[PDB]
Amino acid sequence: DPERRVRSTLKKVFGFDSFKTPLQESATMAVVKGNKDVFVCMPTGAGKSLCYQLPALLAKGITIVVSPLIALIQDQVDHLLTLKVRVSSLNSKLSAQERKELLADLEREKPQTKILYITPEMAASSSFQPTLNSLVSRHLLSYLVVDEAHCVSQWGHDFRPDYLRLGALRSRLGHAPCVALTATATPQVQEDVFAALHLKKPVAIFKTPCFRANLFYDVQFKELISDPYGNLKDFCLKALGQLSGCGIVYCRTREACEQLAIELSCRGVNAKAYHAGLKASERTLVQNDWMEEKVPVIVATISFGDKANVRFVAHWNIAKSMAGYYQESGRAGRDGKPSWCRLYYSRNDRDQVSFLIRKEVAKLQEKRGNKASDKATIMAFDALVTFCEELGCRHAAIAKYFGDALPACAKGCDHCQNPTAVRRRLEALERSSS
Ligand SMILES: Nc1ncnc2c1ncn2[C@@H]1O[C@H](COP(=O)(O)OP(=O)(O)O)[C@@H](O)[C@H]1O
Ligand SMILES: O=C(NC[C@H]1CCCO1)NC1CCCCC1
Ligand SMILES: [Mg+2]
Ligand SMILES: [Zn+2]
C-alpha cells in the first residue's frame, strides 16, 4: 500500500490529515508510482509543492528541484527546515566553505541530503558537472523536478534562457522520472514545456479545468447605454437582492475610481474608492470596512494582498489581458452560489488600454532591445478584445484560451441565454459610427 505510506508522511512530516483537493492527491500518487512523466497545472496556492516534496521522502535516492530564484529557493528551504527534513541549496549566495561541505555530502554513498534545490544557471554550470555525473554513475537520483516550468516559454510571460538547458539534462537522467509544475495554463506554454524538457510520452497531466458553472458572464457596450452610472447602479443592486452579499467594481484610473464611488453612493448604493494614491491608514479602513460588511461595494484599482460571498465583479474598463480578466472576475462566487461577472467595454476604452500597453513595450525595447516575448503581451490583450466583440458563449471563449473542451453553459451567459439580444447589440455598435 502506497496510500498507507503517503497518508503517514502527510501527517508525521507535513501535519495534514487530508489533501486540499482530489486533484492534488491524484497528482501526488502518480509521482510516487514513478513510471511516467508528469505535468501539474494548478493555480498558485493550490499546493503544487507537496506533489513532489512528499514523494521525494518515500524514495531511496535524491530529488533535484529546479526553481528560478534564490529568494524562492530560500523560502522553500526554510519551510522544510522548520519541518525537520534534510534539505540543502546550492547557489552563488553560499560561501566556499559551506559549498565544500555540501559537495562532500553528495560524493558519499547514501548521502544525508534528501532534496537539493538548485537554480537553472547552477544546474547548467561547468563547476557542477562532476558531482552530477557521479550521482548518475551510482544510480542515486530518484527524480528531476522543474518548478515554475513555464519559464521555458516565450508565451509564458517570464522567459529565462537557462531553462532551455534543462532538456539535455533530462535525457541524461533517463532512468529517473521528471515532474514539471506551473500555474500558467495556456496550451502553447504546455506545448513549449513538453518539447523544451524532452518529456517522455504519454505524459500524465493533472490540470484544473477553468469552467465555473455558477458564474453568469455578460459584456455591455458603453456607446449604447443612455445612463451609464445608473445601469451599473441597478446591476450592483440586482446582484445583492436575493440586502445580501458584497461586490467589486474594477477600473484603471484614480480619478474614475473616486467618481465611480461618488456616483454609486449618490444614487442608492454605498461605495468607497480604493487606490495607491490615498494613505495607508485610509487603505486599511476601506479594506476592513468591506471585509466585515459595513460598506457593501468597494471601487478599486489594485488588489488587497480571500472572500466567500462576492455576488458580483464588474469591470468598468477592459483589463490588460485575458489572464488578467479571468483572475479578477474569478474573485466572484467562491461560496458556489450564483454570482454575476460583467465587463463594460467600449472602443475608446480599448484604444486607451491598447496605447498604454505599447508605450510600456517601447520602454522595455529602449532598455534591452527587441524580444520575441513582447508579442505574447500583445496577443494576451487581443484575446480579451475578441471576447468582447464576438458572438459566442462567454465560458467557451475562456475555455478555448486555456485549452479546455466545450463546457455545458446552463444558459450561464448572455449569448447562450439569448443569442439574438447579443446580435442586435453588436449590430447597433456598428451603427453608432455609421
Ligand atoms: N494537503 C494539504 N492540506 C493543507 N494545506 C496544504 C496541503 N498541501 C499544501 N498545503 C499548503 O498550501 C500552501 C500553498 O502551497 P504551495 O506548495 O506553495 O502552492 P503552489 O506552489 O501551488 O502555489 C502552503 O502553505 C502549503 O503548506
Ligand atoms: O487559473 C488561474 N487562477 C487565477 C488565480 C491567480 C490568483 C488569483 O486568481 N491562473 C492561471 C495563471 C494564468 C494563466 C493560467 C491560469
Ligand atoms: Mg510553487
Ligand atoms: Zn454560454
Side-chain angles (χ1 to χ4, degrees), residues 63-83 85-92 94-109 111-122:
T63 285
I64 295 181
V65 174
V66 177
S67 194
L69 292 176
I70 301 154
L72 186 61
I73 290 173
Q74 196 58 238
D75 287 359
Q76 287 280 22
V77 172
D78 290 336
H79 201 284
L80 291 168
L81 285 168
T82 61
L83 309 158
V85 175
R86 291 198 176 77
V87 59
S88 24
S89 166
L90 189 50
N91 47 18
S92 64
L94 277 187
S95 59
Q97 182 57 20
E98 287 173 319
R99 186 169 197 257
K100 186 171 278 177
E101 291 175 23
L102 179 59
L103 292 166
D105 179 38
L106 300 168
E107 218 81 290
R108 299 172 196 170
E109 57 273 349
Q112 292 217 12
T113 289
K114 197 64 173 164
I115 298 167
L116 173 60
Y117 277 75
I118 191 166
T119 40
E121 48 277 21
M122 291 286 306

Short mmCIF file of all heavy atoms in Angstrom, two decimals, residues 63-122, unseen atoms left out:
data_model
loop_
_atom_site.label_atom_id
_atom_site.label_comp_id
_atom_site.label_asym_id
_atom_site.label_seq_id
_atom_site.Cartn_x
_atom_site.Cartn_y
_atom_site.Cartn_z
N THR A 63 16.29 13.81 -4.79
CA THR A 63 15.46 14.56 -5.71
C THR A 63 16.15 15.93 -5.92
O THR A 63 16.53 16.61 -4.94
CB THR A 63 14.03 14.68 -5.15
OG1 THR A 63 13.34 13.44 -5.30
CG2 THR A 63 13.22 15.75 -5.86
N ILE A 64 16.35 16.28 -7.20
CA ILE A 64 16.87 17.59 -7.61
C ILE A 64 15.69 18.42 -8.08
O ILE A 64 14.87 17.93 -8.86
CB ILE A 64 17.92 17.45 -8.73
CG1 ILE A 64 19.13 16.70 -8.16
CG2 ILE A 64 18.32 18.83 -9.27
CD1 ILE A 64 20.29 16.48 -9.11
N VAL A 65 15.62 19.66 -7.61
CA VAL A 65 14.47 20.53 -7.82
C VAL A 65 15.01 21.83 -8.36
O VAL A 65 15.86 22.44 -7.72
CB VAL A 65 13.68 20.82 -6.52
CG1 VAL A 65 12.58 21.85 -6.75
CG2 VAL A 65 13.07 19.54 -5.95
N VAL A 66 14.52 22.24 -9.52
CA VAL A 66 14.98 23.44 -10.20
C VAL A 66 13.90 24.49 -9.99
O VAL A 66 12.73 24.28 -10.34
CB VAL A 66 15.25 23.18 -11.71
CG1 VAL A 66 15.66 24.46 -12.42
CG2 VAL A 66 16.31 22.10 -11.89
N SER A 67 14.31 25.62 -9.40
CA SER A 67 13.43 26.76 -9.11
C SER A 67 14.14 28.00 -9.66
O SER A 67 15.37 28.03 -9.66
CB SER A 67 13.24 26.90 -7.60
OG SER A 67 12.16 27.76 -7.27
N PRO A 68 13.38 29.02 -10.11
CA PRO A 68 14.04 30.12 -10.85
C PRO A 68 14.91 31.08 -10.04
O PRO A 68 15.91 31.56 -10.58
CB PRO A 68 12.87 30.90 -11.46
CG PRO A 68 11.69 30.00 -11.37
CD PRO A 68 11.92 29.14 -10.16
N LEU A 69 14.54 31.35 -8.78
CA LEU A 69 15.17 32.39 -7.96
C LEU A 69 15.59 31.90 -6.56
O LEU A 69 14.86 31.14 -5.91
CB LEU A 69 14.21 33.58 -7.81
CG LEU A 69 13.92 34.42 -9.06
CD1 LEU A 69 12.87 35.49 -8.76
CD2 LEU A 69 15.18 35.07 -9.61
N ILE A 70 16.74 32.40 -6.11
CA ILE A 70 17.34 32.04 -4.81
C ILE A 70 16.42 32.50 -3.65
O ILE A 70 16.37 31.85 -2.60
CB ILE A 70 18.76 32.65 -4.65
CG1 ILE A 70 19.71 32.17 -5.76
CG2 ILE A 70 19.36 32.30 -3.29
CD1 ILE A 70 20.85 33.13 -6.06
N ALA A 71 15.70 33.60 -3.88
CA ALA A 71 14.66 34.10 -2.96
C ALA A 71 13.50 33.12 -2.76
O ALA A 71 13.00 32.97 -1.64
CB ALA A 71 14.14 35.46 -3.43
N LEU A 72 13.06 32.45 -3.82
CA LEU A 72 12.00 31.43 -3.70
C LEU A 72 12.55 30.06 -3.23
O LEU A 72 11.85 29.29 -2.54
CB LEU A 72 11.22 31.30 -5.02
CG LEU A 72 9.99 30.38 -5.07
CD1 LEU A 72 8.89 30.81 -4.10
CD2 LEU A 72 9.45 30.32 -6.50
N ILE A 73 13.80 29.75 -3.60
CA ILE A 73 14.52 28.60 -3.03
C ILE A 73 14.61 28.74 -1.51
O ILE A 73 14.25 27.83 -0.79
CB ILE A 73 15.95 28.44 -3.62
CG1 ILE A 73 15.86 27.97 -5.07
CG2 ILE A 73 16.77 27.43 -2.81
CD1 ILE A 73 17.18 27.94 -5.83
N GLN A 74 15.07 29.90 -1.03
CA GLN A 74 15.26 30.14 0.41
C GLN A 74 13.96 29.97 1.24
O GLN A 74 13.99 29.31 2.29
CB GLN A 74 15.90 31.52 0.68
CG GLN A 74 16.49 31.70 2.08
CD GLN A 74 17.55 30.66 2.44
OE1 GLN A 74 17.43 29.93 3.43
NE2 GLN A 74 18.61 30.59 1.63
N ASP A 75 12.85 30.52 0.76
CA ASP A 75 11.55 30.33 1.40
C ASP A 75 11.19 28.86 1.49
O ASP A 75 10.68 28.41 2.50
CB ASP A 75 10.45 31.11 0.66
CG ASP A 75 10.54 32.63 0.88
OD1 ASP A 75 11.44 33.08 1.62
OD2 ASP A 75 9.70 33.39 0.33
N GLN A 76 11.49 28.11 0.44
CA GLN A 76 11.24 26.66 0.42
C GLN A 76 12.15 25.91 1.39
O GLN A 76 11.69 25.00 2.08
CB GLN A 76 11.44 26.10 -1.00
CG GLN A 76 10.35 26.45 -2.00
CD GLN A 76 9.10 25.58 -1.87
OE1 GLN A 76 8.85 24.98 -0.82
NE2 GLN A 76 8.32 25.52 -2.93
N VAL A 77 13.42 26.29 1.42
CA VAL A 77 14.43 25.64 2.26
C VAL A 77 14.09 25.83 3.76
O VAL A 77 14.05 24.84 4.51
CB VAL A 77 15.86 26.17 1.92
CG1 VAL A 77 16.92 25.66 2.90
CG2 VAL A 77 16.25 25.74 0.51
N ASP A 78 13.84 27.08 4.15
CA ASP A 78 13.34 27.45 5.49
C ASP A 78 12.02 26.75 5.87
O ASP A 78 11.90 26.21 6.98
CB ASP A 78 13.18 28.98 5.64
CG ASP A 78 14.51 29.73 5.68
OD1 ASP A 78 15.57 29.15 6.04
OD2 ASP A 78 14.49 30.94 5.34
N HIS A 79 11.03 26.75 4.98
CA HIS A 79 9.82 25.93 5.20
C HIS A 79 10.20 24.47 5.62
O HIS A 79 9.82 24.00 6.68
CB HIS A 79 8.90 25.92 3.96
CG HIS A 79 7.47 25.56 4.25
ND1 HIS A 79 7.06 24.26 4.49
CD2 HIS A 79 6.35 26.33 4.33
CE1 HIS A 79 5.76 24.25 4.72
NE2 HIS A 79 5.30 25.49 4.63
N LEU A 80 11.00 23.81 4.80
CA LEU A 80 11.34 22.41 5.02
C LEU A 80 12.29 22.20 6.20
O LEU A 80 12.30 21.11 6.79
CB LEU A 80 11.93 21.80 3.75
CG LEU A 80 11.00 21.59 2.56
CD1 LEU A 80 11.83 21.25 1.34
CD2 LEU A 80 10.00 20.47 2.82
N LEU A 81 13.09 23.22 6.55
CA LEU A 81 13.95 23.15 7.75
C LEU A 81 13.12 23.23 9.04
O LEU A 81 13.47 22.56 10.02
CB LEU A 81 15.07 24.20 7.75
CG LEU A 81 16.29 23.99 6.81
CD1 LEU A 81 17.17 25.24 6.70
CD2 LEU A 81 17.12 22.75 7.18
N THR A 82 12.02 24.01 9.05
CA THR A 82 11.09 24.01 10.21
C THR A 82 10.24 22.74 10.34
O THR A 82 9.56 22.59 11.34
CB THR A 82 10.15 25.26 10.26
OG1 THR A 82 9.33 25.32 9.09
CG2 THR A 82 10.94 26.55 10.36
N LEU A 83 10.26 21.86 9.34
CA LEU A 83 9.60 20.55 9.42
C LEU A 83 10.58 19.39 9.61
O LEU A 83 10.20 18.24 9.38
CB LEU A 83 8.80 20.31 8.13
CG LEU A 83 7.83 21.41 7.68
CD1 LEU A 83 7.53 21.31 6.19
CD2 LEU A 83 6.54 21.36 8.49
N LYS A 84 11.83 19.67 10.03
CA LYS A 84 12.85 18.63 10.33
C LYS A 84 13.15 17.66 9.16
O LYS A 84 13.15 16.44 9.32
CB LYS A 84 12.49 17.85 11.62
N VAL A 85 13.37 18.24 7.98
CA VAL A 85 13.67 17.49 6.75
C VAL A 85 15.07 17.84 6.26
O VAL A 85 15.51 19.00 6.38
CB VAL A 85 12.66 17.82 5.62
CG1 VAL A 85 13.05 17.12 4.32
CG2 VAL A 85 11.26 17.40 6.04
N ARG A 86 15.75 16.85 5.70
CA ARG A 86 17.11 17.05 5.22
C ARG A 86 17.08 17.64 3.81
O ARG A 86 16.90 16.94 2.82
CB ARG A 86 17.92 15.75 5.35
CG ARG A 86 18.19 15.41 6.82
CD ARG A 86 19.33 14.42 7.05
NE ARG A 86 19.58 14.24 8.49
CZ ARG A 86 18.83 13.50 9.32
NH1 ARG A 86 17.76 12.82 8.90
NH2 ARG A 86 19.17 13.42 10.60
N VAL A 87 17.25 18.96 3.74
CA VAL A 87 17.16 19.75 2.52
C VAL A 87 18.26 20.83 2.49
O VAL A 87 18.43 21.59 3.44
CB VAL A 87 15.77 20.41 2.39
CG1 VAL A 87 15.46 21.34 3.57
CG2 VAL A 87 15.64 21.18 1.08
N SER A 88 19.00 20.90 1.39
CA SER A 88 20.03 21.92 1.20
C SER A 88 19.84 22.59 -0.16
O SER A 88 19.03 22.13 -0.97
CB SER A 88 21.42 21.29 1.34
OG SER A 88 21.40 19.90 1.06
N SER A 89 20.57 23.69 -0.36
CA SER A 89 20.52 24.52 -1.57
C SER A 89 21.94 24.81 -2.03
O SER A 89 22.82 24.99 -1.18
CB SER A 89 19.80 25.85 -1.32
OG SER A 89 20.04 26.79 -2.38
N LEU A 90 22.15 24.87 -3.35
CA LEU A 90 23.46 25.13 -4.00
C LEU A 90 23.37 26.34 -4.94
O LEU A 90 22.65 26.30 -5.95
CB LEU A 90 23.94 23.88 -4.75
CG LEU A 90 25.36 23.83 -5.33
CD1 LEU A 90 26.43 24.22 -4.32
CD2 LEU A 90 25.66 22.44 -5.87
N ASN A 91 24.07 27.42 -4.61
CA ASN A 91 23.95 28.70 -5.32
C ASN A 91 25.08 29.68 -5.01
O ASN A 91 25.84 29.48 -4.06
CB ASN A 91 22.58 29.35 -5.02
CG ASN A 91 22.23 29.35 -3.53
OD1 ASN A 91 23.09 29.18 -2.66
ND2 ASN A 91 20.94 29.53 -3.24
N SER A 92 25.16 30.76 -5.80
CA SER A 92 26.15 31.85 -5.62
C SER A 92 26.21 32.39 -4.19
O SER A 92 27.30 32.58 -3.64
CB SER A 92 25.90 33.00 -6.60
OG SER A 92 24.65 33.64 -6.36
N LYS A 93 25.05 32.60 -3.58
CA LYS A 93 24.94 33.17 -2.22
C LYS A 93 25.56 32.35 -1.08
O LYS A 93 25.70 32.86 0.03
CB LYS A 93 23.46 33.45 -1.88
N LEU A 94 25.92 31.09 -1.34
CA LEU A 94 26.65 30.28 -0.35
C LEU A 94 28.12 30.64 -0.35
O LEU A 94 28.67 31.09 -1.36
CB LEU A 94 26.51 28.77 -0.62
CG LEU A 94 25.30 27.98 -0.13
CD1 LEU A 94 25.55 26.50 -0.41
CD2 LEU A 94 24.99 28.18 1.35
N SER A 95 28.76 30.40 0.80
CA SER A 95 30.21 30.55 0.94
C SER A 95 30.92 29.39 0.26
O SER A 95 30.30 28.37 -0.06
CB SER A 95 30.60 30.58 2.42
OG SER A 95 30.19 29.40 3.09
N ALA A 96 32.23 29.55 0.06
CA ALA A 96 33.09 28.48 -0.47
C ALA A 96 33.30 27.35 0.55
O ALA A 96 33.59 26.21 0.17
CB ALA A 96 34.43 29.04 -0.93
N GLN A 97 33.16 27.67 1.84
CA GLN A 97 33.28 26.69 2.92
C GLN A 97 32.07 25.74 2.95
O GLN A 97 32.24 24.52 2.90
CB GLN A 97 33.45 27.40 4.27
CG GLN A 97 33.64 26.50 5.49
CD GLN A 97 34.82 25.55 5.37
OE1 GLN A 97 35.74 25.77 4.58
NE2 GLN A 97 34.82 24.48 6.16
N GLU A 98 30.88 26.33 3.04
CA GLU A 98 29.60 25.59 3.00
C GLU A 98 29.42 24.78 1.71
O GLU A 98 28.99 23.63 1.76
CB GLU A 98 28.40 26.54 3.18
CG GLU A 98 28.23 27.08 4.59
CD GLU A 98 27.14 28.14 4.71
OE1 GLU A 98 27.03 29.01 3.83
OE2 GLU A 98 26.39 28.13 5.71
N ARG A 99 29.77 25.40 0.57
CA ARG A 99 29.80 24.73 -0.75
C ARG A 99 30.66 23.45 -0.75
O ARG A 99 30.29 22.47 -1.39
CB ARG A 99 30.27 25.70 -1.87
CG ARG A 99 30.18 25.14 -3.30
CD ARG A 99 30.38 26.19 -4.41
NE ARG A 99 29.91 25.74 -5.74
CZ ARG A 99 30.67 25.30 -6.77
NH1 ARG A 99 32.00 25.22 -6.70
NH2 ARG A 99 30.07 24.94 -7.91
N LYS A 100 31.80 23.46 -0.05
CA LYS A 100 32.66 22.27 0.06
C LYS A 100 32.04 21.17 0.93
O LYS A 100 32.19 19.98 0.64
CB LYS A 100 34.06 22.65 0.59
CG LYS A 100 35.06 21.50 0.60
CD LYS A 100 36.49 21.92 0.94
CE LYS A 100 37.21 22.49 -0.28
NZ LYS A 100 38.59 22.97 0.03
N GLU A 101 31.36 21.58 2.01
CA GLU A 101 30.68 20.64 2.91
C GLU A 101 29.54 19.90 2.22
O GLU A 101 29.37 18.69 2.43
CB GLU A 101 30.16 21.36 4.17
CG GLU A 101 31.26 21.86 5.11
CD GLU A 101 30.75 22.68 6.30
OE1 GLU A 101 29.57 22.54 6.70
OE2 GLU A 101 31.53 23.47 6.85
N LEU A 102 28.76 20.62 1.40
CA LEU A 102 27.64 20.02 0.65
C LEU A 102 28.10 19.08 -0.45
O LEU A 102 27.54 17.99 -0.59
CB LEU A 102 26.74 21.11 0.03
CG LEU A 102 25.53 20.67 -0.82
CD1 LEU A 102 24.59 19.81 0.00
CD2 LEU A 102 24.79 21.88 -1.38
N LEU A 103 29.10 19.49 -1.23
CA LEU A 103 29.65 18.65 -2.32
C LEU A 103 30.28 17.38 -1.77
O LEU A 103 30.21 16.33 -2.41
CB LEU A 103 30.66 19.42 -3.18
CG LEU A 103 30.10 20.56 -4.05
CD1 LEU A 103 31.21 21.46 -4.59
CD2 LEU A 103 29.27 20.00 -5.18
N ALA A 104 30.89 17.49 -0.59
CA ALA A 104 31.35 16.32 0.14
C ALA A 104 30.19 15.37 0.44
O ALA A 104 30.27 14.18 0.12
CB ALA A 104 32.06 16.74 1.43
N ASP A 105 29.10 15.90 1.00
CA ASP A 105 27.89 15.09 1.30
C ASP A 105 27.37 14.33 0.07
O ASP A 105 27.01 13.15 0.17
CB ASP A 105 26.77 15.94 1.95
CG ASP A 105 25.49 15.13 2.27
OD1 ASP A 105 25.55 13.95 2.69
OD2 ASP A 105 24.38 15.68 2.08
N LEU A 106 27.37 14.98 -1.10
CA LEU A 106 26.88 14.36 -2.34
C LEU A 106 27.81 13.26 -2.89
O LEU A 106 27.32 12.36 -3.57
CB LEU A 106 26.64 15.43 -3.41
CG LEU A 106 25.62 16.50 -3.04
CD1 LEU A 106 25.66 17.66 -4.02
CD2 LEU A 106 24.21 15.92 -2.98
N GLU A 107 29.11 13.34 -2.58
CA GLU A 107 30.12 12.35 -3.03
C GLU A 107 30.28 11.09 -2.14
O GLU A 107 31.06 10.19 -2.48
CB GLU A 107 31.49 13.02 -3.25
CG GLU A 107 32.26 12.49 -4.46
CD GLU A 107 31.79 13.12 -5.76
OE1 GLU A 107 30.66 12.82 -6.21
OE2 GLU A 107 32.55 13.92 -6.35
N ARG A 108 29.54 11.02 -1.02
CA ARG A 108 29.39 9.77 -0.24
C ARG A 108 28.45 8.80 -0.94
O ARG A 108 27.79 9.17 -1.90
CB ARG A 108 28.79 10.06 1.14
CG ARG A 108 29.61 10.97 2.01
CD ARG A 108 28.86 11.36 3.26
NE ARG A 108 29.52 12.51 3.86
CZ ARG A 108 29.05 13.24 4.86
NH1 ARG A 108 27.88 12.96 5.44
NH2 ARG A 108 29.76 14.28 5.30
N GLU A 109 28.36 7.57 -0.43
CA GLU A 109 27.25 6.67 -0.79
C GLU A 109 26.21 6.77 0.31
O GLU A 109 26.56 6.93 1.48
CB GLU A 109 27.69 5.21 -0.99
CG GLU A 109 28.42 4.54 0.17
CD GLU A 109 29.91 4.77 0.17
OE1 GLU A 109 30.46 5.27 -0.84
OE2 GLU A 109 30.55 4.45 1.20
N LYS A 110 24.93 6.70 -0.07
CA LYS A 110 23.81 7.08 0.81
C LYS A 110 24.05 8.42 1.56
O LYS A 110 24.23 8.41 2.78
CB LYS A 110 23.52 5.95 1.80
N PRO A 111 24.08 9.56 0.83
CA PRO A 111 24.15 10.91 1.44
C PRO A 111 22.99 11.28 2.37
O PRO A 111 21.88 10.76 2.21
CB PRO A 111 24.12 11.84 0.23
CG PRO A 111 24.70 11.04 -0.87
CD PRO A 111 24.21 9.65 -0.64
N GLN A 112 23.25 12.19 3.31
CA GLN A 112 22.20 12.72 4.20
C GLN A 112 21.18 13.65 3.51
O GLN A 112 19.99 13.57 3.82
CB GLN A 112 22.81 13.42 5.43
CG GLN A 112 23.53 12.47 6.39
CD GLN A 112 23.37 12.81 7.87
OE1 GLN A 112 22.54 13.65 8.26
NE2 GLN A 112 24.16 12.15 8.70
N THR A 113 21.65 14.51 2.60
CA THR A 113 20.77 15.39 1.80
C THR A 113 19.71 14.59 1.03
O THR A 113 20.04 13.66 0.28
CB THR A 113 21.57 16.24 0.79
OG1 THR A 113 22.32 17.23 1.49
CG2 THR A 113 20.66 16.95 -0.21
N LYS A 114 18.46 14.95 1.22
CA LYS A 114 17.36 14.24 0.58
C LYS A 114 16.69 15.01 -0.57
O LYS A 114 16.11 14.38 -1.47
CB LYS A 114 16.32 13.89 1.66
CG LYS A 114 15.33 12.81 1.27
CD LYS A 114 15.98 11.47 1.01
CE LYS A 114 14.91 10.41 0.80
NZ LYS A 114 15.45 9.16 0.17
N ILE A 115 16.73 16.35 -0.52
CA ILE A 115 16.14 17.23 -1.53
C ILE A 115 17.19 18.32 -1.79
O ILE A 115 17.68 18.93 -0.84
CB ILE A 115 14.79 17.85 -1.05
CG1 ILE A 115 13.74 16.77 -0.79
CG2 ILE A 115 14.20 18.80 -2.09
CD1 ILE A 115 12.52 17.30 -0.05
N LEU A 116 17.55 18.56 -3.05
CA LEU A 116 18.56 19.56 -3.40
C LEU A 116 17.94 20.60 -4.30
O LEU A 116 17.56 20.29 -5.43
CB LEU A 116 19.74 18.89 -4.12
CG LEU A 116 20.85 19.78 -4.71
CD1 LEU A 116 21.54 20.66 -3.67
CD2 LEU A 116 21.88 18.92 -5.43
N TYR A 117 17.80 21.83 -3.79
CA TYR A 117 17.29 22.95 -4.58
C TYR A 117 18.46 23.56 -5.31
O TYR A 117 19.55 23.71 -4.75
CB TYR A 117 16.59 24.01 -3.72
CG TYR A 117 15.14 23.67 -3.43
CD1 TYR A 117 14.81 22.69 -2.49
CD2 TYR A 117 14.09 24.32 -4.11
CE1 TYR A 117 13.47 22.37 -2.22
CE2 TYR A 117 12.76 24.00 -3.85
CZ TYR A 117 12.45 23.03 -2.90
OH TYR A 117 11.12 22.71 -2.64
N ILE A 118 18.23 23.89 -6.57
CA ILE A 118 19.29 24.47 -7.39
C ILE A 118 18.67 25.37 -8.44
O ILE A 118 17.56 25.13 -8.87
CB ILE A 118 20.17 23.34 -8.01
CG1 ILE A 118 21.44 23.92 -8.64
CG2 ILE A 118 19.41 22.49 -9.02
CD1 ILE A 118 22.49 22.88 -8.96
N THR A 119 19.38 26.42 -8.81
CA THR A 119 18.94 27.29 -9.90
C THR A 119 19.27 26.67 -11.27
O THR A 119 20.12 25.77 -11.33
CB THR A 119 19.58 28.68 -9.75
OG1 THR A 119 20.94 28.52 -9.34
CG2 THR A 119 18.84 29.49 -8.69
N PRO A 120 18.57 27.09 -12.36
CA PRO A 120 18.91 26.59 -13.72
C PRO A 120 20.31 26.97 -14.21
O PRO A 120 20.97 26.17 -14.88
CB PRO A 120 17.83 27.22 -14.63
CG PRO A 120 17.29 28.37 -13.86
CD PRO A 120 17.43 28.03 -12.40
N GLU A 121 20.75 28.18 -13.87
CA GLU A 121 22.15 28.56 -14.05
C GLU A 121 23.14 27.57 -13.39
O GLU A 121 24.05 27.08 -14.06
CB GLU A 121 22.42 30.03 -13.63
CG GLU A 121 21.88 30.52 -12.28
CD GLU A 121 20.41 30.95 -12.31
OE1 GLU A 121 19.68 30.53 -13.23
OE2 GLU A 121 19.96 31.70 -11.41
N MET A 122 22.92 27.21 -12.13
CA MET A 122 23.78 26.24 -11.41
C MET A 122 23.69 24.79 -11.95
O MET A 122 24.68 24.04 -11.95
CB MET A 122 23.46 26.25 -9.91
CG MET A 122 23.87 27.53 -9.17
SD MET A 122 25.64 27.76 -8.84
CE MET A 122 26.04 26.23 -8.00
#
